[PDB]
Amino acid sequence: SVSFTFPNFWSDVEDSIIFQGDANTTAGTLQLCKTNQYGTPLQWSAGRALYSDPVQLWDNKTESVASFYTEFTFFLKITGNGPADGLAFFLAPPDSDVKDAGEYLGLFNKSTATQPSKNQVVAVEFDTWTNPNFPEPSYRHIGINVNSIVSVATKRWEDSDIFSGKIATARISYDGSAEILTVVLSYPDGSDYILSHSVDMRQNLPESVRVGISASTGNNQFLTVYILSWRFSSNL
Amino acid sequence: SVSFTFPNFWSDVEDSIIFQGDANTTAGTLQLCKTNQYGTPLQWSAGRALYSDPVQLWDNKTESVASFYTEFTFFLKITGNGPADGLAFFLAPPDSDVKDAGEYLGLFNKSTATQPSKNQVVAVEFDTWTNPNFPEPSYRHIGINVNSIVSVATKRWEDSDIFSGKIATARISYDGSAEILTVVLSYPDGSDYILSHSVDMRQNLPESVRVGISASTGNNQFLTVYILSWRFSSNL
Amino acid sequence: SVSFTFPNFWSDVEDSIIFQGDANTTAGTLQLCKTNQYGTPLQWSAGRALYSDPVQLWDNKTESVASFYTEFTFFLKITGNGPADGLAFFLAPPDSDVKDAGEYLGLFNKSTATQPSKNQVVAVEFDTWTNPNFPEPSYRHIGINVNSIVSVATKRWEDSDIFSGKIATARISYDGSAEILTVVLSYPDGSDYILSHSVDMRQNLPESVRVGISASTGNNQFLTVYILSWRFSSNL
Amino acid sequence: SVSFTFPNFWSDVEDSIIFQGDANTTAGTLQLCKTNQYGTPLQWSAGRALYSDPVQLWDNKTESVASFYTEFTFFLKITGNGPADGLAFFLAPPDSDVKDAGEYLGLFNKSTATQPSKNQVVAVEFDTWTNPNFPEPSYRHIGINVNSIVSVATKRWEDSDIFSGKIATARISYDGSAEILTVVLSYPDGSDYILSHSVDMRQNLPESVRVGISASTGNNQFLTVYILSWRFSSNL
Ligand SMILES: *[C@@H]1O[C@H](CO)[C@@H](O[C@@H]2O[C@H](CO)[C@@H](O)[C@H](O)[C@H]2NC(C)=O)[C@H](O)[C@H]1NC(C)=O
Ligand SMILES: *[C@@H]1O[C@H](CO)[C@@H](O[C@@H]2O[C@H](CO)[C@@H](O)[C@H](O)[C@H]2NC(C)=O)[C@H](O)[C@H]1NC(C)=O
Ligand SMILES: *[C@@H]1O[C@H](CO)[C@@H](O[C@@H]2O[C@H](CO)[C@@H](O)[C@H](O)[C@H]2NC(C)=O)[C@H](O)[C@H]1NC(C)=O
Ligand SMILES: *[C@@H]1O[C@H](CO)[C@@H](O[C@@H]2O[C@H](CO)[C@@H](O)[C@H](O)[C@H]2NC(C)=O)[C@H](O)[C@H]1NC(C)=O
Ligand SMILES: CO[C@@H]1O[C@H](CO)[C@H](O)[C@H](O[C@H]2O[C@H](CO)[C@H](O)[C@H](O)[C@H]2O)[C@H]1O
Ligand SMILES: CO[C@@H]1O[C@H](CO)[C@H](O)[C@H](O[C@H]2O[C@H](CO)[C@H](O)[C@H](O)[C@H]2O)[C@H]1O
Ligand SMILES: CO[C@@H]1O[C@H](CO)[C@H](O)[C@H](O[C@H]2O[C@H](CO)[C@H](O)[C@H](O)[C@H]2O)[C@H]1O
């Protein structure tokens, strides 16, 4: 059983959050990627914020899988028409470090991003940029990734919400018995996105893992991701 | 596309909410079942609060199913050791009225509660009382009901949370493409319940329906359910 | 050095709040005056909710009036054009009990309401009814009462806010050194009422007092006051 | 009759807020003074954020000082034992620009900071550093400044709250009729600071003024002030 709550990141979350890549706290929020003194986000950057304590995903001698829930708010600071690349919530082995930037969201490497058998990561992505390098929706989208940058299921993410300049609330749940991952993205306006898909953690990740949030950028400099709050709870 | 938000029920929600059975507003909240002048809940009562506007669940000539999300907070005013019977969120034909009280949660009739083919209702229940009349967990529980008072899937609901005297937050989502219903129950302490199950609305409900919240009581008078807030959104 | 916080009144505030007259808790709120089973407020009723623990207002040889701050939210459920009589925050001797209803706000008796030397109560009133019995604004108003139902200072209270059907936030502060009482009434719309006046508690109240909120009604039955939250802190 | 509300500073408040000195927005907040790429605050810096629209303070032949109320939250990011210099809310002529840093809080010049007749500024200061250059409390404090860096009235500000690492809420009100300025500083823990003092804006400021918040630093580099939200309303 694991749980934590960050109403904000004003306190010294140093002894509770592992910062990878560019990740760090900025004025009570988590800023995954670096910006210059002029507030302009740097190109090809990546960062991740992983919770220190590990999570018992499942048991082998019991085959019993754990359930978990996470909720976090984020703001997309967009100053252009081509924001990239987005952010993602994810689970990975405790020693997993930041990977490639750009379309890989700091989760995979260029060489194996499309090879599930060569990865150990499950994530829900909020993709603000359609990439031609591999198969994916031609529109902004939300998706569930199982050991691959190519989502197993996606949902269209409206630009009116992406460029809304409003605080979004992401909720992700997983029922260990049913083996179902669900994501709900909500905007203060009146729009909710719902995406669910069956996924068995036992065949995609080790018994013990860490949870975190990742973000990255490519050539454009029109986007900076900020996480305002974050809580999580898990039960075997 | 349908959506609404009730941060509270202080306003005159008369021209937006259909009250069934005992249901009504009480000091900014929805109180489904009646209590006396001494605050004591009456026995064998039932009540439902349905949103006026109908929701397009699915399309026949398109086979396309809609997705929706709902969130609401509730408080369990318990004054004894045997609180019953609980509450539930549900979807049913627009002309569906309150049914039997007690273990039926105002959703089914005594005679057909266990006969799916004789019902038109999908619900997520928060059952505070184990009934011997039909099969169900011997402990307090949360469940998904598909045209029957006998849940297709359940999750244990800890008494420490039920008798916590705290405001609970219920979240229910449905992905029309994946045909998955998910429920998350959260307590300000640090406990989250997650329950997901595949369910196809097309074979359980008509194209157009109404959403609502229901509650009922039996012989005991140790429980009074109050809904503090409620919002919903749906998209075809 | 006394302080307390009530984010709501869902818990059993029995062993912390002294209920006088009709006062009691109702669905997470404080309802000072009673209503029938039809939700209709009874005529000529009065009620007060005083915090159990007494507050040290001042001292003699020590010479040091205590400072305090209190904040609370309330809703005016109005169903007619003649709401009466309103509510008030007050300080009085620990053994002070509810007084007369109607225009006296449960704070004074009919025979001495206009005689300062015969009373022991300082209060901030939110008067929704202009009375001709004694001098007072011919319009709804907010006021500072020092041992009298006749305010020493008042501020007009716009009807657009009174019948707004929105939750109001009251803030009352007192600087024991400057001997100044300040009241600020705020509405979510965009209106703030400010009223300050010099007042020396030492010559109007005993060294030890209790703080509370009261309300009352007269002939009309168009108003029911509800207090949703309440907090207070003091320092000698 | 001017009013504005900033629940945060995530939006482009460019066409609503005049940034002076180092002031600017940082991740949804206002950062008055600059910090390097290492998050270290620069020495001897100053910045102010004034609301664009001017406020009508008072009139002559009309005789009617306007009343106003303002509320804002701020966080003191402290990394050392000598945080300086603090922040302040103020009113000054519309064309007033940032002044000297250090102990002057960006509000006065070194040569005239102690000369009321040479200044046009009324403010509430939150001084985290006792200066020996001029008379002031030998302990951290809150104060009301009338055309001088030497407060006419002050209140001790406990270090437990200053180094608390929690978000503080400041509330400032002014009754134009009573000519009374009141400040209330509140911490989520359970401490409220109250300070009131008589002040006539008519003899200290022009008929039209601008309101804002300022901050500054000296030699030490242990403090960085952040304003998370800010709202204000006024009425002639
Ligand atoms: C406020 O109302 C409550 C209603 O609950 C009163 O307490 C109840 O009193 C009845 C008997 O009159 C008991 O059967 C209940 O068990 C009590 N309820 C609780 C929660 O204890 C209470 O007396 C009223 N307070 C005042 C001052 O009249
Ligand atoms: C919900 O409760 C309200 C109580 O406010 C009921 O309204 C009252 O109804 C009675 C008759 O039943 C009238 O005499 C009163 O004038 C009504 N009160 C007000 C303020 O108008 C209402 O009937 C209840 N709703 C339902 C569906 O039962
Ligand atoms: C506050 O900082 C912002 C940083 O964004 C400054 O505005 C930027 O100015 C640079 C050039 O110096 C431009 O490339 C950016 O496009 C601007 N950003 C935005 C959002 O417009 C701004 O000048 C600073 N304000 C002050 C008073 O110094
Ligand atoms: C996150 O940002 C902070 C900025 O506050 C970094 O802390 C500074 O690190 C430099 C050296 O890298 C030190 O000289 C400063 O003294 C530090 N500042 C403070 C206030 O202690 C921190 O290094 C960053 N964390 C990571 C993992 O990069
Ligand atoms: C014009 O298309 C761009 O070509 C680049 C090589 O010339 C590169 O493929 C780029 O994609 C990269 O940047 C975008 C936008 O910033 C995004 O971050 C991608 O993930 C990243 O690979 C093409 O857009
Ligand atoms: C002692 O068991 C009770 O027997 C009753 C008949 O004598 C009846 O079955 C009752 O159940 C009813 O009340 C409970 C508790 O209030 C609950 O509401 C059930 O749904 C309702 O059927 C038995 O508990
Ligand atoms: C018909 O008007 C009533 O006259 C009374 C004397 O005959 C008395 O003034 C009464 O006022 C009372 O009711 C109002 C409205 O409820 C209010 O509560 C007053 O405080 C109360 O004295 C008149 O309505």
Ligand SMILES: CO[C@@H]1O[C@H](CO)[C@H](O)[C@H](O[C@H]2O[C@H](CO)[C@H](O)[C@H](O)[C@H]2O)[C@H]1O
């Ligand atoms: C070494 O102490 C410094 O002496 C200065 C004169 O030589 C001056 O008093 C200085 O104070 C300055 O820095 C502090 C801390 O940052 C504060 O900002 C004061 O306002 C500023 O004048 C002393 O630190």
Ligand SMILES: [Ca+2]
């Ligand atoms: Ca992409």
Ligand SMILES: [Ca+2]
């Ligand atoms: Ca049951």
Ligand SMILES: [Ca+2]
């Ligand atoms: Ca009156």
Ligand SMILES: [Ca+2]
């Ligand atoms: Ca100083």
Ligand SMILES: [Mn+2]
């Ligand atoms: Mn993608």
Ligand SMILES: [Mn+2]
């Ligand atoms: Mn059940």
Ligand SMILES: [Mn+2]
């Ligand atoms: Mn009055």
Ligand SMILES: [Mn+2]
């Ligand atoms: Mn000072």
